[PDB]
Amino acid sequence: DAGITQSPRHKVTETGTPVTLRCHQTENHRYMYWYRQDPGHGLRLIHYSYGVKDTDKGEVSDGYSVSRSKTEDFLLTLESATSSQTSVYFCAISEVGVGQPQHFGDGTRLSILEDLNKVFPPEVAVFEPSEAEISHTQKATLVCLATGFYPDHVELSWWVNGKEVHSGVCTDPQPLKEQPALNDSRYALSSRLRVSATFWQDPRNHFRCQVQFYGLSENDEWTQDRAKPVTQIVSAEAWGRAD
């Protein structure tokens, strides 16, 4: 119960595109903040605001501007529109006073790419449990592979009998570079769902691995012969077998 909604949660766009990120907050008077988070640097303050139409700059404000036309909204607009502004962006809120702790939103994953022909959706494949595993352990592991995607804005989930499960699953926290020497390199991600042999041996059970990919939107330009790598869901599925 923080009361913060950041929109959008994911944005993929080319250099030259101004990007506005919105932070909505529901509790009348509030101090508001925009941060970015990056691997070697922690959280760095971009801009902050003590009330309507009152804003000031933090340590990394260069390339950014900010707007507070009303108490509910703090808009961060990416002015310079540049590949170094690829980051995770976090809105925070604080009660009006002096020195009150800040509470954060859930984040915005933003990738600014110098070349959009680099952008690729995942291929998704499901691999069925080994017969050896079933007889050795009385258990059955399915693996999902999402291969060849760029950039990593993916969300993998497992659906059994039309419903999302979380028990028995583990997905790699970090994706794997398909070509480690390459800068622009496409990615792969693996996940496992383990069930009892019994549950897999029931053929009424349907198993789906869903990969939500975030990519290009309507106003992004596209001139290649392949289908535009838009924000999409790619899935693979499998049914139980009596072996």
Next chain:
Amino acid sequence: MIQRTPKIQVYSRHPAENGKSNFLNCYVSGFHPSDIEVDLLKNGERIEKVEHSDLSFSKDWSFYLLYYTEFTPTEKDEYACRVNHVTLSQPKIVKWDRDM
């Protein structure tokens, strides 16, 4: 909502001898609310270059302010402080009484 009349003192910074530069002070204190119009007068006409202290307050919440200007006293010249405030229905003039 409480309103308090300003108590006004007109006096010099140093003890006053004629033809020696000094400072003329008007101190207003004990007042509420803080909006106040204070002028310093030389022969009944307003002195322009006149500074004041930053608004502060006492234990009882009432405000105080020092208005001051650099001057040089004579026998002939009359000096006064002209104060206006919501508690007063007309401006109050207090003349600089040289032994006060």
Next chain:
Amino acid sequence: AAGIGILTV
């Protein structure tokens, strides 16, 4: 140095 434990009424 001024305070850092102040909140609205």
Next chain:
Amino acid sequence: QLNQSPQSMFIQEGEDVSMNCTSSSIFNTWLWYKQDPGEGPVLLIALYKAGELTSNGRLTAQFGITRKDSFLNISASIPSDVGIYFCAGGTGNQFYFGTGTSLTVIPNIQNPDPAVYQLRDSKSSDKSVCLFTDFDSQTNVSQSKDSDVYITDKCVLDMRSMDFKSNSAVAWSNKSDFACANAFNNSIIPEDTF
């Protein structure tokens, strides 16, 4: 600007975890946050006076005497304590954030029987995955090999309805000589099943 140390530490499940920050600047407030992946920092503790505070039960934190230092302690650690932890220091109505400390809890594996299985692709062709699974937590998995073989790191799944947790790692390749007996042998495997 805050120096947090170390960038990524490791605890075995059930142990005590200690965690610190450092600056040359004075700070009047210290905060500790936890970040779970896909989510933002969540405030754990706010410290105001130079002394001892406990607002989780299992989390205790201290504000240093010099006000240039702070720590966080976790007792009876548990797998959900995985995350990125951050200190924040407060001066001049501004908070300054450390660079992240990244905890991973290594699971306790009840009964290992490590094995390597071949799993076939469900709805197409000759496509194949190798799965190294049920190894003890002390086993590490390597990757580099030759460039055409992709090996993931190990993760734990938890089968909540069976009170069973297991580590596993995945490998795959193409039109090679690649097989599951040759998949993980550049990692140090136990005396296990094929």
Next chain:
Amino acid sequence: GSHSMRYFFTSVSRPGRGEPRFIAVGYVDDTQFVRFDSDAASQRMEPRAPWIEQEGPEYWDGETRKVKAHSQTHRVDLGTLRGYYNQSEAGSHTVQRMYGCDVGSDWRFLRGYHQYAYDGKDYIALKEDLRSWTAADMAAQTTKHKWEAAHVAEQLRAYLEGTCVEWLRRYLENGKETLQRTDAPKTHMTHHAVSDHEATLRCWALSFYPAEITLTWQRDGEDQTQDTELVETRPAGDGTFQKWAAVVVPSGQEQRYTCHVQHEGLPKPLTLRWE
């Protein structure tokens, strides 16, 4: 001797004339050292003592942020209080906050305080143990419950017992010459013929620091206050202070009356009579 650091905040709404006027002011004892004024150009905490100029840009930025944050809380407070007391939007109102700390002659912590007022009247204040709140009325009780739930006393006590006394300690050594001084009053007496029956004796104290002074009138050794008049201590404008006290006396009997001067710059209290 004893020393104090105090900060004073005044906010006054001016509906139809923009945002509220905000003036903040810092004192060590009777010496002002910093100000902020929202109608001034700079929008910064500015120095008002020579000994505080030497503080670097991190001090000034920090003090500017804290003071602008004090300003916003009061803006919200003026709006909140207008609603609590069902006052109209058209009228001008005031919010006043005062806090700080006292130290002894060893400069160890002595005392802390934080008082808040609405329209010149007490609203909510921190109790002396620095752990609870006095709420004067129904609307202040709502504020007390809010401040209890946010644990505000704890944060204040931490500032008041730590940060405040350490910065007081630092200022006292940095401004040694002027802050740790005592200037003894220069005393004289005046006489004025009111009538042929009445006379006024006036007892003067000039050029003194600190401003705390006691002026009493005594008759034949027994003190009396019934015909006594005392003005507010007034600044001379040079860091020293001035005060008088007067009695209305039957003329001829001026020999019966003595003025007694007490100040910490006097080793022994002064007596003064019209010869």
